[PDB]
Nucleic acid binder design. Structure first.
Lengths: 93, 247
RNA sequence: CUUAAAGAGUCAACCCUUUGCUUAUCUUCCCUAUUUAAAUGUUAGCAGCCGCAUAGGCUG
DNA sequence: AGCAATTTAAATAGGGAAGATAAGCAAAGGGTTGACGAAAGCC
DNA sequence: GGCTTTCGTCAACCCTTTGCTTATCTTCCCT
């Protein structure tokens, strides 16, 4: 829905890599609006366990499992552009 | 790519105003460079330069004489003379509200950097003076030169120190060009052969006579280059600005 | 680990008194405020009488 | 139950008076802030 | 054998009476 926003000046000064910047993306960058009903916001039911959802999750997870070996052979520039394409397709869907 | 943390409105009182034998007033840049390396030691954040400005500063005393300190009988062996007043050695005292801006290089979040600087400043002592109060320090970064000026203008309001150099000597130009003199460092005279009465026995010690440079006070926004206000330890047993002599 | 390290300035008080800022003034002449126009917006929500009604109807 | 119109021009000038004085007293304090050197009892 | 206390030793001025700087502000433009 929206990208995380980093207010931190040292993090904005230094962070460059993919995960090394992503570890600085916290809940306070827009997601944590006011925070008084957090315990109700994290008590969760598990009614998704159905037939077609579980098989779709399994087939896509194994697809990722089989292709993630080429992901580590990518460069920083690739990872950023590929994940931008993935985010654009995800909001499209 | 530069990173700074600014502590604004550092109200400090009890400052040892005796900068040297011939300078009494604002503490020199050797004091604030010493404060910077003090945090490099206690907090571990290694500090290149410090830009310090004076919001307020009053030397205790009149316009021609400083208020001397009533000494206490603290030496050993002069009991019996303790009922009379202790003799006064000259140490002027002063109060000062300062604004400090430390060049640091940091790799963690700004909150732990602010907390480390706050925990240092709560146990620090500006020029022998107890830090009465200080605002919460804030981190600002100088990516480019416009960002350097952003950090510069974030110290408003304060009168920072810019180096204007020595032409012939200190007294002559202080009358002629009317600039202020202060300790930019020291000159080593003799090696000290007795380390028994010192802080460390292994750190090499020298008797020193303070060298002085001539400086001016300019408001931090009116300073064109912030490197001319950031004092740092130069390799001539002195301190110096990054931008050199202010023109 | 900052000319680091450290330090009680205390006390006391009669500013007094005196006073002439007076004097004389020409503001003054001058002159076009002129010309229009729907008050509309239903512009009123009444008077009796048929009734237990301050419910509901009728009469013009 | 809101509706109240538009432009146009706002005076040119001449003056802002000098002459006097602007007190003389008497006070205004010091009190502590001395480190080396040298006799001289004393562990 | 230092060591810590107290007393004696050695001096002598020409002053002057605020600024130092002087504060972090909108053009294009299209949505």
């Amino acid at each position: 829905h929206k990208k995380g926003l980093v207010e931190d000046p040292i993090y904005r000064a230094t962070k460059t890599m993919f995960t090394e910047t992503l570890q600085c993306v916290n809940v306070n960058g827009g997601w944590f609006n006011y925070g008084d009903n957090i315990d109700e916001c994290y008590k969760i039911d598990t009614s998704f366990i159905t037939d077609t959802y579980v098989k779709q999750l399994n087939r896509y997870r194994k697809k990722l499992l089989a292709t993630k070996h080429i992901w580590f052979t990518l460069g920083e520039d690739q990872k950023i552009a590929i994940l931008q394409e993935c985010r654009v397709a995800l909001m499209l869907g | 790519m530069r990173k700074f943390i600014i502590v604004k409105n550092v109200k400090v009182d009890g400052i040892n105003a005796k900068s040297s034998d011939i300078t009494v007033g604002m503490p020199p840049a050797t004091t604030f460079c010493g404060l910077g390396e003090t945090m490099s030691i206690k907090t571990g954040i290694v500090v290149k330069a410090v830009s310090y400005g004076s919001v307020k500063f009053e030397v205790r005393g009149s316009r021609f004489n400083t208020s001397v300190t009533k000494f206490a009988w603290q030496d050993r062996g002069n009991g019996g003379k303790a009922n009379n007043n202790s003799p006064i050695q000259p140490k002027p005292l002063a109060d000062g509200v300062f604004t400090l801006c430390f060049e640091v290089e940091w790799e963690d979040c700004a909150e732990v950097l602010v907390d480390k600087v706050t925990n240092f400043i709560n146990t620090a002592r500006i020029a022998g003076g107890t830090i009465a109060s200080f605002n919460k320090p804030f981190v600002k970064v100088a990516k480019d030169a416009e960002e350097l000026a952003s950090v510069k203008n974030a110290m408003m309001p304060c009168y920072v120190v810019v180096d204007c150099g020595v032409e012939v000597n200190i007294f002559e130009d202080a009358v002629n060009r009317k600039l202020q003199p202060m300790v930019n460092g020291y000159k080593k005279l003799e090696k000290i052969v007795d380390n028994k009465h010192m802080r460390d026995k292994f750190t090499p010690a020298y008797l020193a006579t303070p060298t002085y440079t001539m400086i001016g006070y300019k408001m931090v926004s009116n300073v064109d280059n912030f490197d001319q206000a950031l004092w740092q330890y130069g390799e001539n047993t002195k301190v110096k600005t990054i931008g050199g002599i202010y023109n």
